[PDB]
Swiss-Prot record, chains A, B:
It is an enzyme of class 2 (transferase). This is Glycogen phosphorylase, muscle form. The gene is PYGM. Its cofactor is pyridoxal 5'-phosphate. Allosteric enzyme that catalyzes the rate-limiting step in glycogen catabolism, the phosphorolytic cleavage of glycogen to produce glucose-1-phosphate, and plays a central role in maintaining cellular and organismal glucose homeostasis. It comes from Oryctolagus cuniculus.
């Protein structure tokens, strides 16, 4: 049908068809009179997976003979979403399968909707890992994703009376065709025990054994025939385990609980044992697998020339003392040499500065669970602090601030400090985030080893985030400048000469118009809710957090409402405000925000006076596959975190690529996006990082804003008095209370500038042509935000390998 | 190679080869440089399963249009063993796959050894169900096996210092190619709750829901292209289940524990909740599935003309009040009519008279767990007792004996009584067992409804128990009389005219000689133990029970030893005594017997004087696939239960079919085997049922035997004094104590007659030719003991359907 989707060969269409019928019959054991769409989804998924394997096997083979340096991406999160379309796209099968399935009298699009998301992540950090995997394959790196195969991923969110209900994501219920169990590479992981000292050195003994079984999932490069591996570990109990009899067998579940469920906070840090066991589990299994692969090439000097280990936040920080443990206790290298090898292997990526997000494990936990790792850690600390002392003699304060060991009512290990000490590179995820790292929380460490600190601004993959979710726009781009930009997104910069082209302007607008219409229909079919598609689509999607300030959005929305009710017969640019995201289950405030959002909807969507001029929708169950639908349909992208809190953001980049304009603060990667497009083509408002520090150091008094802004005063009053909760008048007292007395995120301080900036957005929207020309300037300068750029920078500046765009043979 | 194994076509061999390589590559994702035999086993298993499916689908289709009466075989046990060879055999692919795998440079026999047993049963009752399934398919009945898919089957037995250790049977670890998950037919099962009464009748409410997910496994008929289904249910928790968050997800395991593990007693009855939940679980899911199938043909009058439900012991007895519950509470038929439908649907098979094996559920358990089923049961009891009262007016004793409700310190429901009241036929499993039923435990019930009581002597399938495990003998039979006997085992009777044929005599002996040599090699390779293959192979294999009297065997073995040590220079016919079987984990005595057996081995196998004249081996991990090896290699089959305790036995039949002679008591099916072969061709010794009753009614005093038999006195003394346990002299005090003061099974009373009969066996063995002629008379009269006969009798006399031997089209 459309050309970016590949060739529909006459042979290809014919083979696809017989293979689809083979799987229906042999694999699924159905015939065409009993098959449901689920069966049809499966036969198609099996048919496409068939095309992967030859490549998968050939790619693993290449790495064996070439023996290149290997990259291990360690993460507790992989937010993959659906696999089928992405696979078709990277293999250039999309059009063929469309044809092939059409002639069988099926609608492929309807089949795609049947696939469960692999929701093995919470948000940005999980999804980065997924983009990175796609980019790594596409750039021909010999790279492995390693994580945990959670039986249950991020919970499905239901709204019941405006409240979030959590229910379990049973994503494997119907099976998962993409994975291949490999019970033959199962590995022991040890816990508890104690440490004995010999003549021969330390020994870890009387441990409980949990087995780790890997599952391999193919990660196909973009049209280069590279297929890399994502290996995910599953917990199994051993057979003699506990081994009255019945109970012993049932208790096998204690061991297997390790891989049962993904922890769903991205707000906070909970010092729960189960979580630490998951962290140790992925790191022990992964390192033995790494070492094993290294042995099949005594000599650990070359180890850093063959192995690179990237740590995605501190979650797998135990890789460091675990690598030491192996090298020292098992291979019997001396400390200094093992330590050299470890630092040259490991590198660390930080994703936040919020102090409550930092991992600080209680020492009593590590002592019971990992007694040897604590020994190694104390030894790491001691030797590190002697370097500190020697470089800053007499500075006893530096020494307490820099310790990997925090004193206090309970001793904790600061995991971030561990990663800096034992890594050769530490990076932030957007330029301002990396500066803040150097100037505030890791200032001491930076003064000690400035060479360790780097920046790697995040990106998103344009395969999923443009070609896949937005074929219309990818096609009209490709009409003008070719297809080469799909793996070289810098070429989008050539759309700049199309800024005054009348045909392009019309086409860009037409695609947006189509995505809006299609999404509005998705809204009626799947959730029975009813929106004007001529309105501006104002969307905020992302996890619910105080620092992301969905509340600031709420205050605007309430203001628009109030101004409509004051002069109801005046013209306003109509808007559909859509807000979505999950709250971590125990994050009370986050759950209150979701309730407010639906409560505003109950009032605004049912005022006869408001008409279809304002609508407030809370988008239920935000997740990767919902983002693929809502992002292309958006006009306004809301990125309104308080300056200095959002490390990078990546949602922001998805929207830029897809033809929304951005209203946002100079936070995170927003800064670089505006720098790339021109501040004129951006809606920037509010405090800069500096303004926030000025406010802090004199004190944030929220009362001041309440006193000078009558529009604001009114809103707080409606909140307090029961306007939005007529049955429980005091429902929102916590929010009003927080906003007034202990807002760490200064919602009121940005309110005035935000509302004004919002009026400027409405003003540009009244002029369709000028709105679209601005869109074009945005879409055209989005090239920097490809994860191909990001990964190429990691590769050269941290891992020491060279990207390759060259096809492997089919 | 050999002709019973089918054609090696040139096309067949060629297709098998490409399909094997397709699965290796596409399904297993290996290539020939990394594949292990496990991978090779799998590609072959996938290749053979391919040949099933077309037939599986076509067979289900036939039943849809023909709409015949359907048989549901309900059992908590299916002791299947390996599937691959059996599948090849029934499909006539054996020789082709042998050829096909030979040309790939693989040894198929070595690949077969990789398949795990499906050990979803304990012993005879589980394995009967499996034979029955094969026979049902072979006779073209539209029959379904229904059970539970246990995650862990019967434990693997390890001997450690002569003691049984149990370890978990993780049979699904590497996957199971034979099954097809069907998450689309998942069904709710309810527990707990309470009963509300309406104007509209009873309602069961506030229940916990556990979902039951079915797995379908193909059951292929013998060369008739019929493929029937074994459906096994798996427990899954619902998604809103319990639904702080983490714990709620982890607790999903409480619900799923229902299908986690098979209970391993066949001795006793344990009134454990988990077990009752398994019983309810299989019965609720199965009946809804049955009813659903019946609805796709309001009118439940035809229900008994369309549905037959066979209950394998009382384990699924709740089918009865569950069928009532559905019919009365959900479909709103009146009681009398539902009850009529239920009785005409259900039939019951009893497998023992031992009072401690009988299910008697505590009323407090049923009240909490299944409150409505208890109501139905009380109503069943009441209406039943009015029939009793009316037929035997004034007999208040009959009334207490017949009640489904037993009074006593705790009230119990007697599940056997339930099955008789609510079934149109009750059967025993061998002729003497059925008489005993009528004369003792169900005498009252028989007087009430004599027409309900029938006999169905057990059988074994000659596909697994001859063609598969003993190709040598099947071939030499087939040389003389054709292949038709494989599904008409009565034809073996024609071997009677070959009794004086010198060539046959030589061939029968040669095959036995080959199986012995091959098994002796299996003994050295896999368990490093070392046996003279010219000895008589004396084997007792079966679960360890006091009533099966492995102890009586021990006393013989100790006697042979003692006589050798008295006159060491005299000739004795050398013997290898082999004894194997598992003990239920909490059955202390059973575990003591295993220890004695190995302890006798520690003495006898290391006496220089004994030489290779006596050897005692305990065969570890007895299970279906070990039986396939040891049975064909045996000379003497030991079936030495006390008269009146072994309901039928089926091991006994396997040995008869495979050329062992039988030493046994007139117990169970032994009686009919000797009746078929002639008592002259059998080694019968000991008390008859009648003799046991005479001994009881005057009192069994074991001291009497100890006083008059000095050979016996000696053994007890060696036992008591530490002869067989020099380090713990008092180790066996429990056994000596039981034997002397409270032997319920009268081991001493049969000792004299057994030892004498053993001398007669040794005497015949000195004359090879006459031994073999007797073997031939045994093998030749084994036809009655085919499960084809048995199932044909069930079909005509209980289910009311006609067997069909006619091929379905390929
Ligand atoms: C037990 C630990 C629980 C809390 C730790 C945590 C930090 C954090 C950061 N980010 C995002 O990581 C994204 C990828 O770098 C980035 O774009 C976003 O700015 C950043 O907020 C994220 O998505 N989730 C994370 O959870
Ligand atoms: C919770 C309940 C636990 C104990 C109930 C039980 C009875 C019983 C009978 N049989 C055999 O069933 C075989 C099949 O009929 C038969 O040949 C054997 O003679 C008979 O002993 C068996 O194998 N296992 C059974 O367990």
């Amino acid at each position: 049908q459309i050309s970016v989707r590949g060739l529909a060969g006459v042979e290809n269409v014919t083979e696809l068809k017989k293979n689809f019928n083979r799987h229906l019959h042999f694999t699924l054991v159905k015939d065409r009179n009993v098959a449901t769409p689920r069966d049809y989804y499966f036969a198609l998924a099996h048919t496409v997976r068939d095309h992967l394997v030859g490549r998968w096997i050939r790619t693993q083979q290449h790495y064996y003979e070439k023996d290149p340096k290997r990259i291990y991406y360690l993460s507790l999160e992989f937010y993959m979403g659906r696999t089928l379309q992405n696979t078709m796209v990277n293999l250039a099968l999309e059009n063929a399968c469309d044809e092939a399935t059409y002639q069988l009298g099926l609608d492929m699009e309807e089949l795609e909707e049947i696939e469960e998301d692999a929701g093995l992540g919470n948000g940005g950090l999980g999804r980065l890992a997924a983009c990175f995997l796609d980019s790594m394959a596409t750039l021909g790196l010999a790279a492995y994703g390693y994580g945990i195969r959670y039986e249950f991923g991020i919970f499905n969110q239901k709204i019941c009376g405006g409240w979030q209900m959590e229910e379990a994501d049973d994503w494997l219920r119907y099976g998962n065709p993409w994975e291949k169990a490999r019970p033959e590479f199962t590995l022991p992981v040890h816990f508890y025990g104690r440490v004995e000292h010999t003549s021969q050195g330390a020994k870890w003994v009387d441990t409980q054994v949990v087995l780790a079984m890997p599952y391999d999932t193919p990660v196909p490069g973009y049209r280069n025939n590279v297929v890399n591996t994502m290996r995910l570990w599953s917990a199994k109990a051993p057979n003699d385990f506990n081994l009255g009899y019945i109970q012993a067998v049932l208790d096998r579940n204690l061991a297997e609980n390790i891989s049962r469920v993904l922890y769903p906070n991205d707000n906070f840090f909970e010092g729960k044992e189960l979580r630490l066991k998951q962290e140790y589990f992925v790191v022990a299994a992964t390192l033995q697998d790494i070492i094993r692969r290294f042995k099949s090439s005594t000599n650990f000097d070359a180890f850093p020339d063959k192995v690179a280990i990237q740590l995605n936040d501190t979650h797998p920080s135990l890789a460091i003392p675990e690598l030491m443990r192996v090298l020292v206790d098992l291979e019997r290298l001396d400390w200094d040499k093992a330590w050299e090898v470890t630092v040259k292997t490991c590198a660390y990526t930080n994703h936040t500065v919020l102090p409550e997000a930092l991992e600080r494990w209680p020492v009593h936990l590590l002592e019971t669970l990992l007694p040897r790792h604590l020994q190694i850690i104390y030894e790491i600390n001691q030797r590190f602090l002697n370097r500190v002392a020697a470089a800053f003699p007499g500075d006893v304060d530096r020494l307490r601030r820099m310790s990997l060991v925090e004193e206090g009512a309970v001793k904790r290990i600061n995991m971030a400090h561990l990663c800096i000490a034992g890594s050769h590179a530490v990076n932030g995820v957007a330029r301002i985030h990396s500066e803040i790292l150097k100037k505030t929380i890791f200032k001491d460490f930076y003064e000690l080893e400035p060479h360790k600190f780097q920046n790697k601004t995040n990106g998103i993959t344009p395969r999923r985030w443009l070609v896949l979710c937005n074929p219309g726009l990818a096609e009209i781009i490709a009409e003008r400048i070719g297809e080469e930009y799909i793996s070289d997104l810098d070429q989008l910069r050539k759309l700049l000469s199309y800024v005054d082209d009348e045909a392009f302007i019309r086409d860009v607008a037409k695609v947006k118009q189509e995505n809006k219409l299609k999404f509005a229909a998705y809204l009626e079919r799947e959730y029975k809710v009813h929106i004007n598609p001529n309105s501006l689509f104002d969307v905020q999607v992302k996890r619910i957090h105080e620092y992301k300030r969905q509340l600031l959005n709420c205050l605007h929305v309430i203001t628009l409402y109030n101004r409509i009710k004051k002069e109801p017969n005046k013209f306003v640019v109509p808007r559909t405000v859509m807000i979505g995201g999950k709250a971590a289950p125990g994050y009370h405030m986050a759950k209150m925000i979701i309730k407010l959002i639906t409560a505003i909807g109950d009032v605004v969507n049912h005022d006869p006076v408001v008409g279809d001029r304002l609508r407030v929708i809370f988008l239920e169950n935000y997740r990767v596959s919902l983002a693929e639908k809502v992002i292309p349909a958006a006009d306004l992208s809301e990125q309104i975190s308080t300056a200095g809190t959002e490390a990078s953001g990546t949602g922001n980049m998805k929207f830029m690529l897809n033809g929304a304009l951005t209203i946002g603060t100079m936070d995170g990667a927003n800064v670089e996006m505006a720098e790339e497009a021109g501040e004129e083509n951006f809606f920037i408002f509010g405090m800069r990082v500096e303004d926030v520090d000025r406010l802090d150091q004199r004190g944030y008094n929220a009362q001041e804003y309440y006193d000078r802004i009558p529009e604001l005063r009114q809103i707080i009053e409606q909140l307090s008095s029961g306007f939005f909760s007529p049955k429980q008048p005091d429902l929102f007292k916590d929010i009003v209370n927080m906003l007034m007395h202990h807002d760490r995120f200064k919602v009121f301080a940005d309110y005035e500038e935000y509302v004004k900036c919002q009026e400027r957005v409405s003003a540009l929207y009244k002029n369709p042509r000028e709105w679209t020309r601005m869109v074009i300037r945005n879409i055209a300068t989005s090239g920097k935000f490809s994860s191909d750029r990001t990964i190429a920078q990691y590769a050269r500046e941290i891992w020491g390998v060279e990207p390759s765009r060259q096809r492997l043979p089919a």
